[PDB]
């Protein structure tokens, strides 16, 4: 996918201390969870370095995602550092890309 590749490249760009101090809800990374990933990341407020990632994610989610609002993200227990979240998201997206899915 052209959108997928571009998002991979952006995540590589920004991870090679992203939003230092910012914690987000952990996700149970499995296929198609673009909505959940955005539902978590949309809640980061003072970090311009992830703004593009946020816009890019909206392209992959068929519904509007607004901060404070949840639907696709059903579990909110563990909170993790943004850097870790985005690194884990990256490996997940690379797998999708490798799979052709």
């Amino acid at each position: 996918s052209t959108a997928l590749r571009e998002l991979i490249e952006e995540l590589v760009n920004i991870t090679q201390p992203l939003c230092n101090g910012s914690m987000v809800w952990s996700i149970n990374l499995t296929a198609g969870m673009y909505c959940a990933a955005l539902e978590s990341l949309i809640n980061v407020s003072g970090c311009s370095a992830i703004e593009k990632t946020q816009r890019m994610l909206s392209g992959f989610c068929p519904h509007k995602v607004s901060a404070g609002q949840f639907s696709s993200l059903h579990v909110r227990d563990t909170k993790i550092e943004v850097a870790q979240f985005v690194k884990d998201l990256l490996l997940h997206l690379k797998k999708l890309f490798r799979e052709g899915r």
Partner: antibody
Amino acid sequence: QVTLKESGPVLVKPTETLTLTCTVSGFSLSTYGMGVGWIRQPPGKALEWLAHIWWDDVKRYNPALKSRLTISKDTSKSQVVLTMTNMDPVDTATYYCARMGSDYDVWFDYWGQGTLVTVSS
Amino acid sequence: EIVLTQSPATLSLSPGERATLSCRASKSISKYLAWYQQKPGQAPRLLIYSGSTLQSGIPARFSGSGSGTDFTLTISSLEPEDFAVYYCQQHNEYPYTFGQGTKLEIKR
């Protein structure tokens, strides 16, 4: 040093099955980002990608040949195996295995020396 | 399926001269083109990936450039060891495809 070596040259009769093994060194087939592909080249002709497999068993096959191809790997043996059914004289070629030079994209940085497979009666 | 057309089929140049090899794709492949060099009886050798990234161990006379549908491999000043067959391969999309090669031969 990363090395790859294809199993010995083989003769296959038309309709028969080709099995090739690639033995690898200088990397592990369970290490993040490691992948191996097969690429063939008929005598005097261009390279053609066949299939590849990643460290986590994710696989891709050339769609024109998908029904004929299987790829597998075994980390303990450091081996990648390609199986190709219903061989035809047109499949006579040098078969290479090669490592992907990326953790998710498809181009090849280290190559085996190639093995000649001849399909003929 | 992305078709890659390499020009010219055979390029005849003398050592010392600048070479330009062309590779054109049937549709856009963004920047994702790899170049390989191949000598008789030998496996292909990776020279360039993602359009313009020079592989380690490849001398700096080599450069890839281009994007979209038009790509070039150039060599600033040919050395004897550079005469060989050159293949392009796109890695924008599945199925991964290669061009038919340019044979760079010594003009004498």
